[PDB]
Amino acid sequence: NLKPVDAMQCFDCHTQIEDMHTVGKHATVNCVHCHDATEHVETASSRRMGERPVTRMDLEACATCHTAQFNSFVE
Amino acid sequence: NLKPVDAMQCFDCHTQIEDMHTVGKHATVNCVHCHDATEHVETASSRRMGERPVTRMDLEACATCHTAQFNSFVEVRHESHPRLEKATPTSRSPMFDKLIAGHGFAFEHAEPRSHAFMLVDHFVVDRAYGGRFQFKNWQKVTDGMGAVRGAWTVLTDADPESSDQRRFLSQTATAANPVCLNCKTQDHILDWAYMGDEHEAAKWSRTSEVVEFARDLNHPLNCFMCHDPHSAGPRVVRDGLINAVVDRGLGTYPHDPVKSEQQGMTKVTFQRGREDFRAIGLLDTADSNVMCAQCHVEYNCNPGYQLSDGSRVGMDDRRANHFFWANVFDYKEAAQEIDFFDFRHATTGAALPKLQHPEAETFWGSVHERNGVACADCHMPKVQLENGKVYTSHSQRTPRDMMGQACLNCHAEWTEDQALYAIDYIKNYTHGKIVKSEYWLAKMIDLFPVAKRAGVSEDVLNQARELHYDAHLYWEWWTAENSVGFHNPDQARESLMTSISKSKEAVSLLNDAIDAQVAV
Amino acid sequence: NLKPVDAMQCFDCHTQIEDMHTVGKHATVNCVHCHDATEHVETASSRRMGERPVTRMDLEACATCHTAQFNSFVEVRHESHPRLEKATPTSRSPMFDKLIAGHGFAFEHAEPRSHAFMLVDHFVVDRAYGGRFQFKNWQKVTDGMGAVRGAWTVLTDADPESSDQRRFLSQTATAANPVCLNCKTQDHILDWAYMGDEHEAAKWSRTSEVVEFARDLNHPLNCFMCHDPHSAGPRVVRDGLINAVVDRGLGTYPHDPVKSEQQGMTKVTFQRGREDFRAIGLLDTADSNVMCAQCHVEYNCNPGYQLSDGSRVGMDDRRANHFFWANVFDYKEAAQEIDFFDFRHATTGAALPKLQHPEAETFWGSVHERNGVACADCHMPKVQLENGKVYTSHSQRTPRDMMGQACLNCHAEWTEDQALYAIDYIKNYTHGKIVKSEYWLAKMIDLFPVAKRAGVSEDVLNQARELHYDAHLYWEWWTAENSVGFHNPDQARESLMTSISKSKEAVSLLNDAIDAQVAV
Amino acid sequence: VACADCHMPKVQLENGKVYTSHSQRTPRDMMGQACLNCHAEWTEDQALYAIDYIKNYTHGKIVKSEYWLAKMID
Ligand code: HEC
Ligand code: HEC
Ligand code: HEC
Ligand code: HEC
Ligand code: HEC
Ligand code: HEC
Ligand code: HEC
Ligand code: HEC
Ligand code: HEC
Ligand code: HEC
Ligand code: HEC
Ligand code: HEC
Ligand code: HEC
Ligand code: HEC
Ligand SMILES: O=N[O-]
Ligand SMILES: O=N[O-]
Ligand SMILES: [Ca+2]
Ligand SMILES: [Ca+2]
Ligand SMILES: [Ca+2]
Ligand SMILES: [Ca+2]
């Protein structure tokens, strides 16, 4: 089961994502739905990536909340 | 656009919610999807609510992330005939008017139709609110999506200025009361104490004015009746069911102690001012037999009378909200256990039970139930896709519409036509016995006025009234139950043969007494 | 091959015909298409007919230039079940035999079928001519075109040598009389004086021997019943309708003085020997509500009795040919106005009305009528063609067969299945109330013999007979009317609830009186 | 008009929450939602006939263009 991450802590270094995320229709969608950043957050500074976080590119990352669009697409 | 709130701030006070939310599959779903709590957070203390937060009860709160399940749920099955009266020769109970005379169902009792309409159909049926509520016009009867959006977007009230139950047309009744609504909506889930007891924190209770209550309610069969919105895990919310299964210790499967243990229910209680207020029952498994048993059971939800002394039992008594949780052969004993009956027959004067849609108790012990089959396997199966993410159909309907997924997947030896023929064999046989039971009930009922007028003694008439109770129970179970015997064909046959035996016994008693009177 | 005659020569005498023919859309259609008048022209004077010209009344006189309308008209709808008795559990009136006992309809009353058969069905029904007329064999029942060509090309007469009405089989009646034919054919249009009064120039009248009249008639529903053959403009020819609308000044829409003015009727009278003989009513507009109201109304067309003194009213009285032109809630007053009832119930002895197919009076005041919708919009719409000259369908039938043209063109928000579901909701609800009304009527009727035999007083039985009149009227309207409530659902519901109230009142009166007798 | 209007239109439901079809395919599979909603004067067969008139004419000219290119190449 996914556990949400502290998005505010992300935004301390990710102002460009903050300005898009906080304002659009995914403002309540937690980063854990598409990113595995635990080791990244442990090692990064605002000027040094540290460990590369993982980003999901699979279409199933969207299909959990948008099954109808996904199922229509894969027909 | 929604902005998330800080859940940790809520959890500071709401430790039960924290324990459920952080662990289940809604751990990432923010409170703002369903609650507006800004002023609440500013004013609450750890034990006092302060300003009341807003909670969304509409089904579209879930449709945003679960559109497939929502769209499947709101589908209207047009082949399920609407407003179709059961008391006619071509429906379930050709002699219902004679047999049920004295009870409010005589005013109108239609076959069920799609779930989207449950709350609007409750409001407009002729037996419920004296004809007070109507669809805004006769075209709105088709609008399933509209009804789901809210009953009051499709209905009118003949008199918004009064809140008394009264007849607005001559052939209506005012049988509705607050308990009914528990099987039509759970919009009142935060405003109703467990069982509908009087409670300082409850706006509504068993003794409320039902017209005022009605006006506060909007949505049919809320998604959260079966799914905990915080953990997303399987549950029931219906107080009458939790009371039978948990408080009375009868278990989820009263005939099967083992299955009851493997597929059990945990009562969770929520308080107001540190006093118990409302409860839910979390299920060990996603068990649709118990989920659908929130409503598809025999119940009391009405005033009635005591078997011992004939005195009135009102809405204020706990018996006015009761799940018997008994099969047809244990029912008479279950009604003796609470000392209760529903009405006196208008012609025979007999004390009689009123039975309602007992699908859950009928299904117990059937071949399918004993093999671990559940309502959803036949009535809301997984969708089959050539390419796609599988989900569960939420359009609860006859398996005739999806025989590939509801039957033929387990019955590989049959074609669709053979499976349909097997269903019809049972339904045809069962309906023939229901019709014969009604014929014998009517013959008995017709003799009561003849016997009374011939001067037959009260003692003989009372013996016949005692037979009427049983003849009625063992018949009405099956016109009330919706599968026409399919859910338990051997039980239907044994019960309907018992009804006929009881009527024949009563007919013989009355004919002999009438003949003796005439001979003197 | 036809040769034209000189119309100007006709017009020298026939100035009314000249005024109509020269101005309308048949100005180019020569008289020879419908009349053979050679010997007539040689012998007539300006006031004496001389030799009678031949006039074609067959529908093929119009089919030559209007084949599409004719072919559409003669279509047989095989899905409209033929010879289907209404007094059965699966049809319109399961308890009709008990309720109508004493009236000729008890012998046979089938559902309507396609218009092509109206005259042959009139001749062969068991209640009409004692079983005298039959199809030549049981295969001819399918032959719509044959019936249109002429009733006598498909029927036989069991006794051509006699012309009396008598029973040829035991369970028949001889209810037919000359007035009936006015709603089956207008072949007699030149041989029948207005209203069927005795008249020197009329071969047939209300008092004719109906078997002899029958033998002169051939064609169903002539095209000229709605279309003036001379002007081609819209009209009615039915005397009973003209009498209500014009002579009694009630108007085409009795509830709407304005619409009656915009969509009115002008009575035109034709003379014989300079005395009034026959009449037609020219319509201001092609208004199918009024055209179909030539037949689809409640009427008297039969002998009966006076409400005031019980005396016989025979075919000779004008009341034997009468359009009440009243909705169900004004009907009792309309029957008091002419001091008339139809029959005495065989079991209760009550004076009762007999109601017939009152579609036109039911439709008044409905949502559709109030919005300017007319019968033809739902029952004979324009044909829709990808490429072609549009014409009006003349196959009058349920809109279920052409939902695109009859409903969905106005109701763009609905699919066909949703529109059908809306119709069925009303029909299901209405039929349930008809069945409940019958149940209460039967319960009352069953008490009359018990009450009589217990020695209940004439005064109480007469009070119950007065209730029977109303219980009957408010029920029978709806088994007679063919839409099962669809034409006016609110009115059906209010009326059927009134019927039930009246029966319940009668049942309570009789039960209390029987019980008092037994107590003494 | 845009590609999605003919190739991924909104779903039409008697009862339900509208969403956009993401099955990008010929409008022949959903003519009600992809053409006939704007072309009320047409039946489905008439709209299909109009498409085929264009495709048939165009394909004839493609074939003739290939015939002449091939002749030049040879
Ligand atoms: C799936 C629904 C996602 C959610 C929720 C979040 N992110 Fe994301 N992110 C996603 C994808 C598919 C990509 C690849 C780039 C693209 O534009 O599609 C990304 C990328 C980022 C990046 C890299 C941006 C760059 O510099 O190239 C960052 C820094 C990032 N995402 C951060 C982030 C944070 C902090 C979120 C929680 C508030 C978050 N994302 C949500 C997919 C998804
Ligand atoms: C649940 C945790 C979600 C995941 C994972 C994704 N999305 Fe989403 N999306 C979600 C919500 C609650 C909403 C708002 C719904 C509303 O109408 O209020 C959305 C919205 C969209 C939209 C519409 C945006 C608009 O401006 O109209 C799109 C196009 C969308 N979402 C796409 C999308 C994609 C491509 C995802 C995978 C990267 C995805 N979403 C993830 C909930 C959730
Ligand atoms: C998006 C912001 C959501 C809203 C609003 C609701 N739910 Fe949800 N749900 C969501 C996600 C991302 C998941 C997990 C997907 C996965 O499989 O990992 C869920 C899961 C469910 C489940 C399944 C739970 C289980 O199998 O244990 C149910 C039954 C469920 N959700 C129901 C539900 C209801 C009834 C809602 C309205 C009260 C609702 N959800 C809102 C995302 C979102
Ligand atoms: C109380 C909130 C209910 C729960 C939980 C379930 N059902 Fe139900 N059902 C309910 C009502 C009040 C009605 C009649 C609605 C009306 O407006 O008439 C129904 C109807 C059905 C039907 C008939 C549907 C049809 O097409 O005619 C079926 C097959 C049905 N119900 C099945 C069902 C199953 C399988 C459930 C558990 C998954 C279930 N219902 C829950 C009330 C309630
Ligand atoms: C749950 C234990 C219920 C209580 C309490 C009430 N009803 Fe109900 N109702 C229930 C189910 C499962 C169904 C569908 C199955 C069926 O056999 O009908 C229904 C159906 C209705 C309907 C539609 C059918 C009809 O009888 O016309 C109406 C109008 C209805 N219910 C009304 C109603 C009233 C007035 C109640 C309190 C007196 C009431 N219901 C209680 C489940 C439950
Ligand atoms: C009880 C009568 C239910 C109501 C009301 C709702 N759902 Fe349901 N849901 C139900 C069952 C029996 C199941 C299958 C559980 C199993 O594992 O067999 C489901 C499943 C879900 C899921 C999970 C994904 C899936 O299987 O489709 C989701 C997201 C879900 N249901 C959502 C949902 C929504 C949004 C509802 C209101 C429209 C809804 N459910 C009502 C039982 C019941
Ligand atoms: C398959 C093995 C079934 C299981 C498990 C359940 N039901 Fe059922 N039901 C079944 C059949 C074959 C029929 C007759 C349907 C037909 O079209 O002939 C039924 C009927 C119903 C109905 C009435 C549905 C209708 O005809 O529209 C209801 C309300 C219903 N069943 C409910 C129900 C519940 C609540 C169950 C679990 C306790 C249940 N059914 C189990 C097949 C099967
Ligand atoms: C051909 C020699 C004809 C015969 C025989 C009949 N009709 Fe006719 N009709 C004819 C023509 C050329 C026209 C005019 C066509 C036009 O639109 O200009 C008509 C018109 C009618 C109409 C329409 C009248 C109107 O809209 O005002 C009707 C209703 C009509 N005709 C009916 C009719 C009937 C009932 C006939 C048999 C008695 C008949 N027509 C004979 C040509 C011919
Ligand atoms: C008297 C000459 C009539 C006129 C004018 C109209 N109708 Fe009629 N209709 C009439 C009879 C005697 C019958 C029954 C015929 C039989 O043999 O049983 C009918 C029947 C209909 C029906 C039922 C058709 C079916 O398929 O069952 C319809 C829908 C009907 N009638 C409609 C109708 C309309 C709309 C009219 C005006 C355009 C109309 N009728 C005129 C007698 C007469
Ligand atoms: C016009 C005012 C009528 C008079 C006078 C008569 N009938 Fe009729 N009939 C009429 C209509 C509009 C219909 C179809 C609608 C319906 O409800 O039936 C009929 C139908 C018949 C039928 C077929 C149906 C049936 O009852 O079996 C028969 C056999 C029939 N009509 C006979 C009949 C007789 C014997 C009449 C004089 C006593 C008579 N009709 C008068 C319209 C009118
Ligand atoms: C009344 C019950 C009618 C009978 C009998 C006949 N027709 Fe008719 N016709 C009728 C109506 C209501 C209409 C439409 C008028 C409008 O403007 O809406 C028609 C129309 C015609 C026309 C005009 C061209 C067309 O619209 O199709 C013609 C030529 C016509 N009708 C001919 C016709 C014939 C030949 C008939 C006997 C088979 C016939 N009509 C009978 C009403 C009635
Ligand atoms: C549409 C708005 C209608 C108008 C205007 C009229 N009628 Fe009608 N009628 C209508 C429906 C939906 C139905 C039920 C048909 C079904 O298949 O359920 C009817 C029924 C009739 C019938 C019986 C037809 C049959 O079932 O075969 C008759 C004889 C009939 N209607 C006659 C009639 C007349 C004479 C009208 C004008 C006064 C009239 N109808 C108006 C729909 C509509
Ligand atoms: C409707 C007015 C259209 C718009 C806007 C777009 N296209 Fe289209 N496309 C259209 C038709 C009638 C056809 C022929 C389909 C047939 O079955 O005959 C097409 C074809 C395509 C195809 C090939 C599809 C196939 O035959 O399977 C593609 C790849 C396609 N079109 C893409 C496309 C794009 C990217 C558009 C926006 C730039 C676009 N189309 C617009 C109708 C319409
Ligand atoms: C471009 C080729 C697209 C890809 C890849 C995906 N989607 Fe889409 N989406 C697209 C358009 C043109 C639209 C409609 C925009 C409009 O308003 O007309 C959409 C819409 C959505 C929505 C919004 C709700 C709805 O309209 O259905 C959602 C949630 C959405 N799309 C999700 C989605 C998912 C999960 C995808 C991967 C399977 C996906 N989209 C791909 C264009 C494109
Ligand atoms: O009937 N009063 O709620
Ligand atoms: O019944 N004689 O016409
Ligand atoms: Ca049903
Ligand atoms: Ca009960
Ligand atoms: Ca018919
Ligand atoms: Ca009459």
UniProtKB/Swiss-Prot annotation, chain D:
Q: Which residues bind heme 4?
A: H22
Coiled coil: which residue ranges?
none
Q: What is this protein called?
A: Cytochrome c-552
Q: What is its biological role?
A: Catalyzes the reduction of nitrite to ammonia, consuming six electrons in the process. Has very low activity toward hydroxylamine. Has even lower activity toward sulfite. Sulfite reductase activity is maximal at neutral pH.
User: Which cellular compartments is it found in?
Assistant: Periplasm
Positions binding heme 7 in this chain are: C35, C38, H39
Quote the PTM field: Besides, it may lower the pKa of the Tyr hydroxyl group.
Family listed = Belongs to the cytochrome c-552 family.
Annotated residues for binding of heme 8: C3, C6, H7
Oligomeric state and interaction partners are given as: Homohexamer. Dimer of trimers.
Which gene name does the record give? nir
